[PDB]
Amino acid sequence: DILLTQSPVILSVSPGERVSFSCRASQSIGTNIHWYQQRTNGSPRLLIKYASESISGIPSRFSGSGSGTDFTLSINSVESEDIADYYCQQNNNWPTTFGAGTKLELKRTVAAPSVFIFPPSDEQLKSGTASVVCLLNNFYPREAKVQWKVDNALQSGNSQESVTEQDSKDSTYSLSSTLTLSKADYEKHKVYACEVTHQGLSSPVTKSFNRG
Amino acid sequence: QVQLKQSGPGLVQPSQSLSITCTVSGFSLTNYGVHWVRQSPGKGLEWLGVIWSGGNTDYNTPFTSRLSINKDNSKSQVFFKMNSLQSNDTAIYYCARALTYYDYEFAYWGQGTLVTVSAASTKGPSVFPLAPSSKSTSGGTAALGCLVKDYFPEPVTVSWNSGALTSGVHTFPAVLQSSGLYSLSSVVTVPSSSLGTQTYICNVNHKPSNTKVDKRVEPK
Amino acid sequence: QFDLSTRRLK
Ligand SMILES: *[C@@H]1O[C@H](CO)[C@@H](O)[C@H](O)[C@H]1NC(C)=O
């Protein structure tokens, strides 16, 4: 099979900038290469066919060039909606094969998270489990720190985090930190605090509540 | 308009077989071939095979023995079937159509079907409210959400107000709990002044267990 | 590596 090598693995650029993706082939494949875009939760979208031929419905800022073994997909002026993964495909040789992709991230100005805390619902408590949710909304960059404390006791190992992919409109991330306690443990304590640390904050933000 | 719509996501027990139906429209299976591609964590995009206009099939070499593709032209359905699945066959499977009848440049894709190969049992989620409050309201903007907890396998869909509410929505990637069950929150920020006059509902759909829940989320 | 949850490389 033809091996397709995409480089680098991650690209990071600022909006309006030009960016190029590299796709290299294990042996010559002429111009028999196609390019695809994959956005979060999407199926691939065909961007360019046969190295340089344009596709109907695709923005003019997308183009491709190359021949033989060395190929390039370009975006002359990147937009927030371009945040996605990009894949090349060869069909000069059977079976058709795909590269492993390149991730395109967008830089933007620093944005401090908005922090919100949510106690467990009385509904969930009926089931014997308590989830405390802490939400960091619309921040950049992705690096953040969440510290949980129950009655001044540092919590460790009993929380999971999830981070969205970059917003296609404003380029921010959001993060949820969920602290999970048995209902029994939850009832044996009073003060629940979520403490947030981010480059955009001039001091840590603490959101908290007393049970009841 | 050319469209490909695949059957829903689901569990398949190890060593068992996978079945997906691809129903197309805006073209005839008598005029175009239909291709199958998958996307897995370990191998990424793999082309699996194709059924051609006239009924001939090609299968990528590693799959010749356990893959069968069939269609019903009149029904516009293409039928994908793969045998003896192992855990690394866990992938999103797509059906696809090229630009020209003989080619492989895939201009049209189905929405994908997430197939999980696992010994475990299908389980629907419980949906709990993340109620807005003062601890959740700053500068007239309130945050609220739904905790979608303890389901298996992926995925679940979550929308808000039956699709009418999309701005400010973040549905977080699921995380696997130690129980082997997935959990997820979905949030949305809204004007705090609208908490009195607007209803907020997360529409949760877990197709593999056929669990559909509408959860109203009210200030506490 | 492709993530099945988000369909993005992680
Ligand atoms: C999964 O395992 C088989 C052997 O059982 C291996 O040959 C194959 O390459 C693997 N496939 C993936 C998608 O990782």
Residue numbers in the entry:
A (entry chain A): 1 to 212
B (entry chain B): 1 to 220
C (entry chain E): 2 to 11
Publication passage describing the model:
Recently, a unique binding site for a cyclic 12-residue peptide was discovered within a cavity formed by the light and heavy chains of the cetuximab Fab domain. Here, multiple crystal structures of meditope peptides incorporating different cyclization strategies bound to the central cavity of the cetuximab Fab domain are presented. Collectively, the structural and kinetic data presented here indicate that small perturbations introduced by different cyclization strategies can significantly affect the affinity of the meditope–Fab complex.
Other cyclization methods, including the formation of a lactam, reduced the affinity but not to the extent of the linear peptide. Of note, although there is a significant error in the estimation of peptide concentration for AHA-, β-Ala-β-Ala- and Gly-Gly-linked meditopes, the off-rate is independent of the peptide concentration. We speculate that the increased atomic radius of the S atoms is responsible for the favorable hydrophobic interaction with Val9 and Ile10 of cetuximab Fab. As expected, the affinity decreased with increasing distance between the linker and the Fab (Cys-Cys > MPT-Cys > AHA ≃ β-Ala-β-Ala > Gly-Gly > linear peptide), underscoring the importance of van der Waals interactions in this region.
